[PDB]
């Protein structure tokens, strides 16, 4: 993670989990890495058991989380003096959105008994609405690159974790040393054997 906090000051990092430094002390095996862009006025409702506009139509959170969100200001890469409609938000779903699952659709949503199969009626609205990102807009109407990480347990033995603070070497002195999972005490001496290369 050492190379994590050199990507401008963040926006919100409230967490219900473990510390970043003990992420180095505890070796993991599976972590989710997904990202999206939301307007800055709609990031505050990203919380476990939270209700808001983008709460049950694009992305929802369960109780057990093991992680938190990372967000920061992005006004020099996704903001244009004209228009920016590349990103869109969906707010029309028929039923409940399950936590941690993705959904993509293009069919028009029917809010009632109106039969719609490609026509935009007064009760049938398109479920995909685009944003608009201009420098005229203030802080509350700017895109934030919200990225969230979730950790998983009991899937595999640990296979991914950061540096272990390797040190220098000393010779001809009574000091403690440890090897590749082979811990012991002894005197390091150059050998004359012929090891096979496996």
């Amino acid at each position, epitope marked *: 993670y050492s190379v994590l906090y050199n990507f401008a000051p963040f926006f919100a990092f409230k967490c219900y989990g473990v510390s970043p430094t003990k992420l180095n002390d505890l070796c993991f095996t599976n972590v989710y890495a997904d990202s999206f862009v939301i307007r800055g006025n709609e990031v505050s409702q990203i919380a476990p058991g939270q209700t808001g506009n983008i709460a049950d139509y694009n992305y929802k959170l369960p109780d057990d989380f093991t992680g938190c969100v990372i967000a920061w200001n992005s006004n020099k890469l996704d903001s244009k003096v004209g228009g920016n409609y590349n990103y869109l938000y969906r707010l029309f779903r028929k039923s409940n959105l399950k936590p941690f699952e993705r959904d993509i659709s293009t069919e028009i949503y029917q809010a009632g008994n109106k039969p719609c199969n490609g*026509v935009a009626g007064f009760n049938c609205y398109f479920p995909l609405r685009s944003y608009g990102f201009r420098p005229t807009y203030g802080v509350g109407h700017q895109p934030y690159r919200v990225v969230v990480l979730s950790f998983e347990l009991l899937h595999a033995p640990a296979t991914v974790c950061g540096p272990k603070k390797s040190t220098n070497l000393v010779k001809n002195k009574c000091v403690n040393f440890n090897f590749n999972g082979l811990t012991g005490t002894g005197v390091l001496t150059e050998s004359n054997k012929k090891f096979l290369p496996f």
Partner: antibody, heavy 126, light 109 residues
Framework: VQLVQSGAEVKKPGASVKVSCKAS????????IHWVRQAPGQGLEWMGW????????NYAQSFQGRVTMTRDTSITTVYMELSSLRSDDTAVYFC????????????????????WGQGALVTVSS | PVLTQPPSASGPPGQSVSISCSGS????????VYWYQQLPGAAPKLLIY???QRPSGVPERFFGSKSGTSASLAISGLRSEDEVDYYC???????????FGAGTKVTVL
């Protein structure tokens, strides 16, 4: 906004023509430019968009290798290289000004063509 | 599919006329319809966008709307000093591009 350019010179079939319109008064890093021709007696046809930021330009189904698009940031003007002109190319050329920006294939429904002015003319000729 | 449009139109001055643009299921309704108008011997210009917002630069004279298969461009009255063709444009998901209508002549009576 302005689109002042020069008139296109007549080119033989199996050759190349160049049509380019000047862009000024705005930064050329957010507006994708479109090319389209006014076919007489019928509608118009489209081949793709041009993005001056990244190398992500695509092509239409009926226009695979007919057009080749090159970009330039020093002059902020798109450049034309047409190949194998035919008898159906008898139309005037206008560079379509499109507002906004869009890359993926579900965001192009929101924009509209902004500015037309002083188009050129490229048609095949025997 | 290709959008088709009336070749011409006959409307006397002083009374409102409208132009219809028949389409398909995936081209009209689920996608916005844009109306292009071009002067003879000059450059074209957009008339109406998104079927409910009027562009700046024109007075409150024209009107455009969509109703299912066809989109209607209401022309409240007609002046004999300006006769301009109207183009019909839409977007299709299968064709993945812009397809344009034939265009309609307007004449006085």
């Amino acid at each position: 906004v302005q689109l002042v350019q020069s008139g296109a010179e007549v080119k033989k079939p199996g050759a190349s023509v160049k049509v380019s319109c000047k862009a000024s008064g705005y930064i050329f890093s957010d507006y994708n430019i479109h090319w389209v021709r006014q076919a007489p007696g019928q509608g118009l046809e489209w081949m793709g968009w041009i993005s001056p930021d990244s190398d992500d330009t695509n092509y239409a189904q009926s226009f695979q290798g007919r057009v080749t698009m090159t970009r330039d940031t020093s002059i902020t003007t798109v450049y034309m290289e047409l190949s194998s002109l035919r008898s159906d190319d008898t139309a005037v050329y206008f560079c379509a000004r499109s507002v906004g920006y869009c890359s993926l294939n579900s965001c192009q429904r929101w924009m509209w063509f902004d500015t037309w002015g002083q188009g050129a003319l490229v048609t095949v000729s025997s | 599919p290709v959008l088709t449009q009336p070749p011409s139109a006959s409307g006397p001055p002083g009374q409102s006329v409208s132009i219809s643009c028949s389409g398909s299921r995936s081209n009209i309704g689920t996608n916005f319809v844009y109306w292009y108008q071009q002067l003879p011997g000059a450059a074209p210009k957009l008339l109406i966008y998104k079927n409910d917002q009027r562009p700046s630069g024109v007075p409150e004279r024209f009107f455009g709307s969509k109703s299912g298969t066809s989109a209607s461009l209401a022309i409240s009255g007609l002046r004999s000093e300006d006769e301009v063709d109207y183009y019909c444009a839409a977007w299709d998901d299968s064709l993945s591009g812009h397809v344009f209508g034939a265009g309609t002549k307007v004449t006085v009576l």
